[PDB]
Amino acid sequence: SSHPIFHRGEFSVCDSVSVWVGDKTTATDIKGKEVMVLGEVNINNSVFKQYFFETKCRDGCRGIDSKHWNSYCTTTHTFVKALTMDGKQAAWRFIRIDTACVCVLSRK
Amino acid sequence: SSHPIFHRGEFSVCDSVSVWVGDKTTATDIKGKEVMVLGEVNINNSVFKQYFFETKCRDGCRGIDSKHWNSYCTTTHTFVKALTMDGKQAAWRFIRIDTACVCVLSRKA
Amino acid sequence: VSFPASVQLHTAVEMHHWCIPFSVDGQPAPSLRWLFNGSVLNETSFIFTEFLEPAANETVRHGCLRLNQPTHVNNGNYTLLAANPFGQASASIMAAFMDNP
Amino acid sequence: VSFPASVQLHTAVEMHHWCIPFSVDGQPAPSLRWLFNGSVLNETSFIFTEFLEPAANETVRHGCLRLNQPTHVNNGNYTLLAANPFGQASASIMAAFMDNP
């Protein structure tokens, strides 16, 4: 249907998609090292299966002045703590996960 | 500032800044409820100081066709697990935290 | 001339924020109220009702239930209740913003 | 005409990605290698060298050591080593990307 909002609403320059990732087994740490992600963790009790909130680019950018700029959408990341296997022992470490989808400018 | 890159480089549409946030006391959970954020957490006998990687707008967006569009940059979030408090209930809940700065498009006229 | 409230909802869509588009008519203008799964939805800064600017020569209003990054926990049936002195008009819609393992 | 390598680095700058700009000349053109705090820095998908397109008739090359979302663990002294038959040129610069905890 035709609703005024498709014309007058606030849109994104880049389209993304958020999902819940619970089958992550590897990731790169803050040292850029590849590390193993535990499927589970447990706080002085039962276990919490490790899940992650991720947002990546949904399959140039919208509203770009194509006369002076080239552009593209791309997935940026964030650092989040996680129970990992450092390649030696189990540790709480910051891993890199998808977190947003942004627009990249480049002059013409 | 005469380096070619200052001209032929890849630029952000919206500028952000990234910091480690460690003084966070309150936050809102996945249900939108204002909850308390503890400063330490016990992950397997190992006491941890609760820290967060946050990205926010550096306070219209760059490269936008301003003839046809109003626009501005804004801080978007991510949900991350954190030891919080709701009553005498210290829990492992997802909270809302800054994670990016995106450009919001809006037609004019 | 006063007339009863009329209401309609549209299938939720994702723009910058997610939005459940609505259109309501009536005069006096109806008061809006949302229900999530049959129970009242309290608006907050992340889930709130939003009207577009009023058009000239028309009583009909257009807007959105605006959801700022909702999760699977916001999946459900959304009911918009529009009320004025003649009674109440109602419209509902199912919305899914995220799966939920 | 053959000539020894010359090299310079510029203050790190945050754009879409962070970048440590560099300009290098020499004939034969030199091979490049980076150091982080005096030790070999192995390039990855997140920290690598990128050349800008060579300009018209001039052997000088410009580019960046590109850092994709670097943290405080990347803070330190970055050294670019330009080598050719004549020998080697070097340039270093300190870069802070984020304050540590």
Coordinates of N, CA, C and O in Angstrom, one line a residue, chain A residues 12-18 54-62 72-77 97-104, chain B residues 13-14 74 76-77 99-103, chain C residues 16 69, chain D residues 16 69:
Chain A
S12 N 17.7 5.3 6.0 CA 19.1 5.0 6.2 C 19.8 5.2 4.9 O 19.2 5.1 3.8
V13 N 21.1 5.6 4.9 CA 21.9 5.8 3.7 C 22.3 4.4 3.3 O 22.5 4.0 2.1
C14 N 22.4 3.5 4.3 CA 22.8 2.1 4.1 C 21.9 1.2 4.9 O 21.7 1.4 6.1
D15 N 21.5 0.1 4.2 CA 20.6 -0.8 4.8 C 21.3 -2.0 5.5 O 22.3 -2.6 4.9
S16 N 20.9 -2.3 6.7 CA 21.5 -3.3 7.5 C 20.5 -4.4 8.0 O 19.4 -4.3 7.6
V17 N 21.0 -5.3 8.8 CA 20.2 -6.4 9.3 C 20.8 -6.9 10.6 O 22.0 -7.2 10.6
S18 N 20.0 -7.0 11.6 CA 20.5 -7.5 12.9 C 20.0 -8.9 13.1 O 18.8 -9.2 12.8
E54 N 24.5 -9.2 16.4 CA 25.3 -8.7 15.3 C 24.4 -8.0 14.2 O 23.3 -8.4 13.9
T55 N 25.0 -6.9 13.7 CA 24.4 -6.1 12.6 C 25.4 -6.0 11.5 O 26.5 -5.5 11.7
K56 N 25.0 -6.4 10.3 CA 25.9 -6.2 9.1 C 25.2 -5.6 8.0 O 24.0 -5.3 8.1
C57 N 25.8 -5.4 6.9 CA 25.1 -4.8 5.7 C 24.2 -5.8 5.1 O 24.5 -6.9 4.9
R58 N 23.0 -5.3 4.9 CA 21.9 -6.0 4.3 C 22.2 -6.1 2.8 O 22.5 -5.0 2.2
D59 N 22.2 -7.2 2.2 CA 22.5 -7.4 0.8 C 22.4 -6.1 0.0 O 21.6 -6.0 -0.9
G60 N 26.0 2.6 -4.8 CA 26.5 3.4 -3.7 C 25.5 3.5 -2.6 O 24.6 2.7 -2.5
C61 N 25.6 4.5 -1.8 CA 24.7 4.8 -0.7 C 23.5 5.6 -1.1 O 23.6 6.3 -2.1
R62 N 22.5 5.6 -0.3 CA 21.3 6.4 -0.5 C 21.6 7.9 -0.2 O 22.2 8.2 0.8
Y72 N 30.1 3.7 -1.1 CA 29.7 2.3 -0.9 C 29.4 2.0 0.6 O 29.8 2.8 1.5
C73 N 28.6 1.0 0.8 CA 28.2 0.6 2.1 C 29.1 -0.5 2.5 O 29.5 -1.3 1.7
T74 N 29.4 -0.5 3.8 CA 30.3 -1.5 4.3 C 30.0 -1.8 5.8 O 29.6 -0.9 6.5
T75 N 30.3 -3.0 6.2 CA 30.1 -3.4 7.6 C 31.3 -3.0 8.5 O 32.4 -3.3 8.2
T76 N 31.0 -2.3 9.6 CA 32.0 -1.9 10.6 C 31.8 -2.8 11.8 O 30.8 -3.5 11.9
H77 N 32.8 -2.8 12.7 CA 32.7 -3.7 13.8 C 32.7 -3.0 15.2 O 32.7 -1.8 15.3
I97 N 33.2 -8.3 16.4 CA 31.9 -8.8 15.8 C 31.2 -7.7 14.9 O 31.4 -6.5 15.2
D98 N 30.5 -8.0 13.9 CA 29.8 -7.1 13.1 C 28.9 -6.3 14.0 O 28.2 -6.8 14.9
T99 N 28.8 -5.0 13.8 CA 27.9 -4.1 14.6 C 27.1 -3.0 14.0 O 26.2 -2.5 14.6
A100 N 27.4 -2.8 12.7 CA 26.7 -1.7 12.0 C 27.0 -1.8 10.5 O 27.8 -2.6 10.0
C101 N 26.3 -0.9 9.7 CA 26.6 -0.9 8.3 C 26.6 0.6 7.9 O 25.6 1.3 8.1
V102 N 27.8 1.1 7.5 CA 28.0 2.5 7.2 C 28.4 2.8 5.7 O 28.8 1.9 5.0
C103 N 28.3 4.1 5.4 CA 28.6 4.6 4.1 C 30.0 5.1 4.0 O 30.4 5.9 4.9
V104 N 30.7 4.7 3.0 CA 32.1 5.2 2.7 C 32.2 6.1 1.5 O 31.9 5.8 0.4
Chain B
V13 N 31.1 9.1 6.3 CA 29.9 9.9 5.9 C 29.6 10.7 7.2 O 29.3 11.8 7.3
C14 N 29.8 9.9 8.3 CA 29.6 10.5 9.7 C 30.8 10.1 10.5 O 31.3 9.0 10.5
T74 N 23.8 10.3 13.5 CA 23.3 9.9 14.8 C 23.9 8.6 15.3 O 24.3 7.7 14.6
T76 N 24.0 5.0 16.8 CA 23.2 3.8 16.9 C 23.8 2.8 17.9 O 25.0 2.9 18.3
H77 N 23.0 1.9 18.4 CA 23.5 0.9 19.4 C 23.6 -0.5 19.1 O 23.3 -1.0 18.0
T99 N 27.3 1.9 19.6 CA 28.2 1.1 18.8 C 28.6 1.6 17.4 O 29.5 1.1 16.7
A100 N 27.9 2.7 16.9 CA 28.2 3.3 15.7 C 27.5 4.7 15.5 O 26.7 5.1 16.4
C101 N 27.8 5.4 14.5 CA 27.3 6.7 14.2 C 26.9 6.6 12.7 O 27.7 6.4 11.8
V102 N 25.6 6.7 12.4 CA 25.1 6.6 11.0 C 24.4 7.8 10.6 O 24.0 8.7 11.4
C103 N 24.2 7.9 9.2 CA 23.6 9.1 8.6 C 22.1 8.8 8.4 O 21.8 7.7 7.8
Chain C
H16 N 15.2 3.9 9.0 CA 16.3 4.1 9.9 C 16.0 3.4 11.2 O 16.8 2.8 11.8
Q69 N 15.5 0.0 17.0 CA 16.2 -1.2 17.1 C 15.5 -2.2 18.1 O 15.9 -2.4 19.2
Chain D
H16 N 37.9 7.1 7.3 CA 36.9 6.0 7.5 C 37.7 4.9 8.3 O 37.2 4.4 9.3
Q69 N 39.8 0.0 12.4 CA 39.3 0.0 13.8 C 40.4 -0.5 14.8 O 40.2 -1.5 15.5

